[PDB]
Amino acid sequence: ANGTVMSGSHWGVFTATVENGRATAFTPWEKDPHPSPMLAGVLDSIYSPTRIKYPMVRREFLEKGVNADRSTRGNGDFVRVSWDQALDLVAAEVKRVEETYGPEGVFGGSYGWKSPGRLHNCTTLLRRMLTLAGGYVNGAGDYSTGAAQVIMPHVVGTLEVYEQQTAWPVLAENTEVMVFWAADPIKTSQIGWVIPEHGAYPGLEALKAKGTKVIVIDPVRTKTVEFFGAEHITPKPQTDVAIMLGMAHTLVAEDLYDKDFIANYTSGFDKFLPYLDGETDSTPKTAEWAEGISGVPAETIKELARLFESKRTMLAAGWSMQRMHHGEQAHWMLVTLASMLGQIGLPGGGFGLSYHYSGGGTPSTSGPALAGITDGGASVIPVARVVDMLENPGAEFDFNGTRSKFPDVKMAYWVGGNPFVHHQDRNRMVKAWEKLETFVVHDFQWTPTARHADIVLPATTSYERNDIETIGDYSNTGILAMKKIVEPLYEARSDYDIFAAVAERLGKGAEFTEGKDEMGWIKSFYDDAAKQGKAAGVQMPAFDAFWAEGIVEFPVTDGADFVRYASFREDPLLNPLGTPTGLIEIYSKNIEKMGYDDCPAHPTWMEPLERLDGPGAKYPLHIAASHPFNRLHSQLNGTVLREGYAVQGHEPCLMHPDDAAARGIADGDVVRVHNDRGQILTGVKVTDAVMKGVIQIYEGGWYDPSDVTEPGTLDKYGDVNVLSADIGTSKLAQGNCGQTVLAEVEKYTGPAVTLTGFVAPKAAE
Ligand SMILES: NC1=NC(=O)C2=N[C@H]3C(S)=C(S)[C@@H](COP(=O)(O)OP(=O)(O)OC[C@H]4O[C@@H](n5cnc6c(=O)[nH]c(N)nc65)[C@H](O)[C@@H]4O)O[C@H]3NC2=N1
Ligand SMILES: NC1=NC(=O)C2=N[C@H]3C(S)=C(S)[C@@H](COP(=O)(O)OP(=O)(O)OC[C@H]4O[C@@H](n5cnc6c(=O)[nH]c(N)nc65)[C@H](O)[C@@H]4O)O[C@H]3NC2=N1
Ligand SMILES: [Mo+6]
């Protein structure tokens, strides 16, 4: 095979060059306006040293099963087995747990970003097999907008975080002031959940070309700041709600806010105002009070409030500030401030929670929806409570107004996810995993999660199979044929093939496949989309002509004029919101009735577990544990891209020159970052891009424990979740709080370390 083949991924559409059956280059689609340099690593992930070659069973589990010593999971002592042996064992273990403990004994939430593709949807496929086996405990929500997706339905009556934004071209013609509040769109627009079109890049360029005023509110001087030469505000992390309250307070005290908008489109501002004015707690939430907490000068807070009230302003917020203790307060207070400014539903004004994610704002086409394989259908937990569940079987927990009991789980099955990187408080989690009798993982790269499994099955990538998928989570630019580029490597198999074999052994083979093969499933999804298109007046070709061209693109009709909340603004009685009042709920009677101490019935400033310069806080530096520039989470850490950012081989840590100098740390030194939960190594990069008092260690580094049998073992590489706490945002959402982290840093003076996470375990070589 010598030629080229087009396909797609979370990073975009591309064409691969193939030479004697090997992919040798991935070249960006010629219509991609701003491709990601991460494509190089996506191609490298098919072949790197951490590619999973064969099915493996952890030696202890292979010998003793349920009586295994579980304290050694992750030490790398695996045994290679055949596919028939491994498939029989997995089917036997699913059957035994289902039969002994019921569906409540199997956890199949398998949270994860996997790969796009309507057929090869590993996590849906997992749940299709588990439903056929008798059922499972699922997870609810995500780590992404854990709090925001739960509080928004109560405030604005919709999900809001994953819904279309006022279109980019509408902003270029009407916005005078664009605010990126805890958002770094240049960084986070490189990927999509479905294939990305990178629509934010022309949208950002158009704002810059129009000369629109841009303000960034973030502890780090990011590439979004640099792109625009933006006015940059640097709040101490976790204090954005105080800043917003000081802005709101200024708008009332100077008599500037939109009283008519508040009276006509909102409910409960009259119960929020006494709090804001300090009538209930003797503490007026003034700009000065906000400076005391956040460090942002009081006069700067008042001038921004003034500026925002006097100009058509769009508040484009990102999600780091809701991935923290009391995370629900951030976007609730943001909507409350935007309601006082009175521009919601006006062209170019209001707020948007998705301008930094998967092309939100890219004009939607008139094309049809594309759907794929389905799963064939307490039993559900908030996703981030998985370790609490394992440690407290039968215990009660609160979630969004209802109380339930944790199921008693004995097996976990994970595919397309990396919990030994994404979950908070690694040391606690490692100990809690000993409650599981059996842990099964599918991946194509030797992540920490695969290293810690009892049974490891090698999955294929999307580049070794055929699939179909939309281009554009919001734009619906078109539909792509994700064509097979190379044959499956080593003994890797698709998740579909693996679960069909397991289901077959359970006597449910035919039900799992539904009588179809790979192209029979794909053609069925295509034809359904084509039927809907024909009925909508969007004619598409027949499946074989579509597949030969490789893509179908759809036309934009009125999508470039979309203004979010315009129909509500234009007539709120005719087009009410989905809340109990039909209005924006600044005070929520439904939340009040829950009686949750950590989620009051209006936006409130509350002390988090720990914050930079908080009264009595133990550790001195905040860790901006944010999304990586050159990975998708942990994805691509085991590729050639790593050498472009590693420092002495470790994950990098940005540190301000003043904080480095106080510890005698030089640029490029190996340093230990530690607190009461754990300790890791990173390689420092000294730079004033991070504000003083803050260090930046991205999430996604592959945890590489020095000795898994040692409690509190040093991580040799730099997984920042060895340092996070595992607590819920509050009882409302129970979201993860992965960015509520303080720690100390010192030049490292312990034993030298050898990195073992970027080569396969010896027996799997
Ligand atoms: N401290 C902290 N700060 C944060 O900001 C933070 N972010 C959180 C958020 S928002 C999220 S969304 C999570 C993400 O955590 P998530 O577990 O989703 O991270 P990924 O590195 O995308 O894991 C995806 C895995 O799927 C594998 N994979 C891809 N395709 C396939 C396939 O077809 N088959 C199989 N079997 N495997 C496949 C990949 O190789 C990869 O190992 O991390 C969360 N964790 C976080 N912690
Ligand atoms: N390149 C890339 N890699 C990814 O892993 C990736 N993940 C995707 C996912 S699953 C999601 S959920 C989104 C994440 O989108 P999200 O907006 O949650 O991204 P983060 O990088 O966690 O934070 C964005 C900015 O918040 C700033 N920040 C941190 N703490 C604070 C604070 O207290 N206050 C303020 N004002 N700013 C703060 C950080 O400095 C960072 O620049 O990105 C998506 N896009 C992604 N792109
Ligand atoms: Mo996310």
The first and second tokens of residue 354, run together, are 């998705």
Report the 10 Å Cβ neighbour count for 754: 8
Q: Is 319 annotated as a binding residue?
A: yes
- Of 660, 631, 661, 659, nearest in space to 645 by CA: 631
CATH domain 2-29+466-483+514-554 topology: Dimethylsulfoxide Reductase; domain 3 (3.90.55)
Q: Helical H runs in 395-538?
A: 419-422, 426-432, 448-451, 495-505, 509-513, 518-536
Neighbours of 544 (CB within 10 A): 9
Inter-axis angle of helices 240-253 and 269-276, nearest 10: 100
Q: How many helices (H) and strands (E) would you count in the chain?
A: 26, 29
Domain over 596-758 is classified CATH 2.40.40.20: yes
Nearest CA to ligand 2 atom 31: 237
Tokens 């219509």 correspond to 31
Query: Please, what is the end-to-end C-alpha distance for the chain in angstroms?
Result: 26
Atom in ligand 2 nearest the alpha carbon of residue 38: 1
The amino acid occupying position 462 is: S
Q: How far is the CA of 10 from the centre of ligand 1 (A)?
A: 12
* Nearest ligand, measured from the Cα of 295: 2
Q: Which secondary-structure segment (H or E) carries 514?
A: none
Is 669 among the annotated ligand-binding positions? Answer: no
Annotated binding-site residue? 144: yes
| 320, two tokens | 């780091």
Neighbours of 477 (CB within 10 A): 25
The technique is X-ray
- Residues with their C more than 2.5 Å from the N of the next written residue in the chain, i.e. before a break, are 377
- Give the count of beta carbons closer than 10 Å to the beta carbon of residue 302: 21
Distance CA 432, CA 729 (A): 21
Domain with CATH 3.40.50.740 in the chain: 51-142+375-465+491-513
144-363+563-588 carries CATH number 3.30.360.10? no
Q: What is the resolution of this structure in A?
A: 2.0
Domain with CATH 2.40.40.20 in the chain: 596-758
CB 597 within 8 A of CB 713: no
| CA-wise closest residue to 106 among 382, 410, 395 | 410
Our answer on whether the CB atom of 184 is closer than 6 Å to any ligand 2 atom is: yes
Q: How far apart are CA 335 and CA 267, in angstroms?
A: 12
Any atom of ligand 2 within 6 Å of the Cβ of 624? yes
From ligand 3's centre to the CA of 151, what distance in Å? 17
* CATH 3.40.228.10 domain residues, the chain: 144-363+563-588
Q: Which residues touch 303 (CB under 8 Å, ≥6 apart)?
A: none
Question: What is the CB neighbour count within 10 angstroms for residue 529?
Answer: 23
Is the distance from CB of 477 to CB of 365 less than 8 angstroms? yes
Among 658, 655, 760, 651, which residue's Cα sits nearest to residue 699? 651
- For 310, the token pair is 């006097």
Distance of CA 521 to the CA centre of its chain: 29
The C-alpha atoms of residue 28 and residue 30 are separated, in whole angstroms, by: 6
Nearest residue to 527 (alpha-carbon basis) of 544, 543, 505: 543
Give the whole-angstrom CA distance, residue 63 versus residue 65.
Answer: 6
Candidate of 44, 418, 502 to mutate for ligand 1, largest count of ligand atoms within 8 Å of Cβ: 418
Please answer whether residues 469 and 116 qualify as being in contact, where contact means their C-beta atoms are separated by less than 8 angstroms: yes
Q: Which two tokens stand for residue 464?
A: 């070794």
| 113 Cα: distance to centroid of ligand 3 (angstroms) | 8
List the structure tokens of 531: 């039927």
- Beta carbons of 454 and 443 less than 8 angstroms apart: no
Closest CA to 23 of 4, 36, 38, 8: 4
Give the DSSP H/E element, type plus range, for residue 211: none
Supply the DSSP string of 50-85, one letter for each residue.
TB--S-EEEHHHHHHGGGS-GGGTTS--EEE--HHH
**Which atom of ligand 2 is the closest one to the Cα of 319?**
18
Helix 328-341 / helix 240-253 crossing angle, nearest 10 deg = 20
Distance between CA atoms of residues 451 and 703, nearest Å: 10
Q: If you search the block for the tokens 């056929």, which residue do you land on?
A: 132
Closest ligand 2 atom to residue 633 Cα is 5
* Widest pairwise Cα distance in the chain: 76
Structure-token pair, residue 369: 């929806």
To 10 degrees, what angle do helices 148-155 and 328-341 make?
40
Among the bound ligands, name the one nearest to the CA of residue 448.
1
632 and 10 Cβ atoms separated by less than 8 Å: yes
Burial of 316-333, coded b for 16+ CB within 10 Å and e otherwise, reads bbbbbbbbbbbbbbbbbb
The closest residue, in CA terms, to atom 46 on ligand 1 is: 422
Q: List own/partner pairs for 644-650 with CB under 8 A and 24 or more apart.
A: 646/683, 647/682, 647/683, 647/684, 647/685, 648/683, 649/683, 649/717, 649/755, 650/681, 650/682, 650/683, 650/716, 650/717, 650/718, 650/755
- Residue pair 358/350 in contact by the 8 Å Cβ criterion: no
Tokens in use for 356?
């930094």
Ligand 1 neighbourhood includes 323 CB (under 6 angstroms): yes
Mutate to test the pocket of ligand 2, among 217, 626, 656, 691 (most ligand atoms within 8 A of CB): 626
Count CB neighbours of 128 within 10 A: 24
CA torsion 404→405→411→417, rounded to 10°? 40
What is the C-alpha radius of gyration for the chain, rounded to an integer number of angstroms? Answer: 26
Q: CB–CB of 94/132 below 8 Å? A: no
Ligand 1, atom 34: closest residue by C-alpha: 416
CA 184–ligand 2 middle distance (angstroms): 6
Alpha-carbon gap, residue 185 to 654, rounded angstroms:
20
Of the candidates 559, 581, 584, 558, the residue with the CA atom closest to the CA atom of residue 569: 584
Question: How many other CB atoms are found less than 10 A from the CB of residue 688?
Answer: 12
Contact 720, 677 (CB under 8 A): no
Q: Take residue 214 and report the two structure tokens written for it.
A: 């841009």
Helix (H) or strand (E) holding 214: strand 213-217
456 phi/psi in degrees, rounded to 5: -115, 125
- Give residue 112 CA to ligand 1 midpoint distance, Å: 5
Helix (H, G, I), strand (E, B) or coil at 275: helix
Give me the CATH code for the 51-142+375-465+491-513 domain, please.
3.40.50.740
Q: How many CB atoms lie within 10 A of CB 65?
A: 15
Q: Does the beta carbon of 114 sit less than 6 angstroms from any atom of ligand 1?
A: yes
Cα separation, 632 vs 638, whole angstroms: 12
Residue 229 CB partners (closer than 8 Å, separation 6+):
none
Q: Are 428 and 457 in contact (CB under 8 A)?
A: no
Query: Distance between CA 198 and CA 202 in Å, rounded?
Result: 8
Q: Residues near 360 by Cβ (< 8 Å), separated by ≥ 6?
A: 164, 165, 200, 352, 353, 354, 473, 474
Distance of CA 742 to the CA centre of its chain: 21
402 is in an annotated binding site: no
- Both tokens of 634, joined, read 């942990």
Reported as type and span, the H/E element at residue 443 is strand 438-443
Dihedral over Cα of 86, 90, 92, 93: its sign: positive
Nearest CA residue ID for atom 9, ligand 2: 144
Work out whether strand 3-7 and strand 14-19 pair parallel, antiparallel, or are unpaired.
antiparallel
What's the 509 CA to ligand 1 centre distance in angstroms? Answer: 29
d(CA 69, CA 67): 7
Q: Give me ligand 1 centre to Cα 418, in Å.
A: 5
Side-chain half-sphere exposure of 493, counting CA atoms within 13 A: 18
187 ligand 2 Cβ < 6 A? yes
Q: Whose CA is nearest to atom 33 of ligand 2?
A: 237
Q: Which residues make Cβ contacts (< 8 Å) with residue 289, sequence separation at least 6? A: 242, 246, 283
List beta partners, residue 380. Answer: 138
* Rounded-to-integer distance, Cα 60 and Cα 589, Å: 54
Instruction: Round to whole Å and give the CA distance between 374 and 127.
Output: 9
421, 680 contact by CB (below 8 A): no
Q: Is 563 helix (H, G, I), strand (E, B) or coil?
A: coil
Q: Which helix (H) or strand (E) holds 14?
A: strand 14-19
Q: Which atom of ligand 1 is nearest to the CA of 323?
A: 5
Coarse DSSP helix, strand, coil percentages of the chain, rounded to the nearest 5 percent: 35, 20, 50
Quote the CA–CA distance of 470 and 192 in Å, as a whole number. 10
Query: How far apart (Å, rounded) are the C-alpha atoms in residues 77 and 751?
Result: 24
The reply to whether 186 sits in an annotated binding site is no
Q: CA 449, CA 423: separation in Å to the nearest integer? A: 11
Hey, which residues are catalytic here? 111, 113
Burial 73-108 (b: 16+ CB within 10 A, else e): bbbbebeebebeebbebbbebbbbbbeebebbbbbb
| C-alpha distances out from residue 410 to 97, 101, 256, 505, Å | 7, 8, 59, 21
Q: Is 239 annotated as a binding residue?
A: yes
Beta-bridge partner residues of 439: 412
Find out whether 696 is annotated in a ligand binding site. Answer: no
Residue 409 is encoded by which pair of tokens? 């789980």
The alpha carbon of residue 106 and the mean position of all alpha carbons in its chain are separated, in whole angstroms, by: 24
Query: Does the beta carbon of 143 lie inside 6 Å of ligand 1?
Result: yes
Residue ranges of the chain that CATH labels 3.90.55.10:
2-29+466-483+514-554
Judged by its nearest atom, the ligand closest to the C-alpha of residue 319 is 2
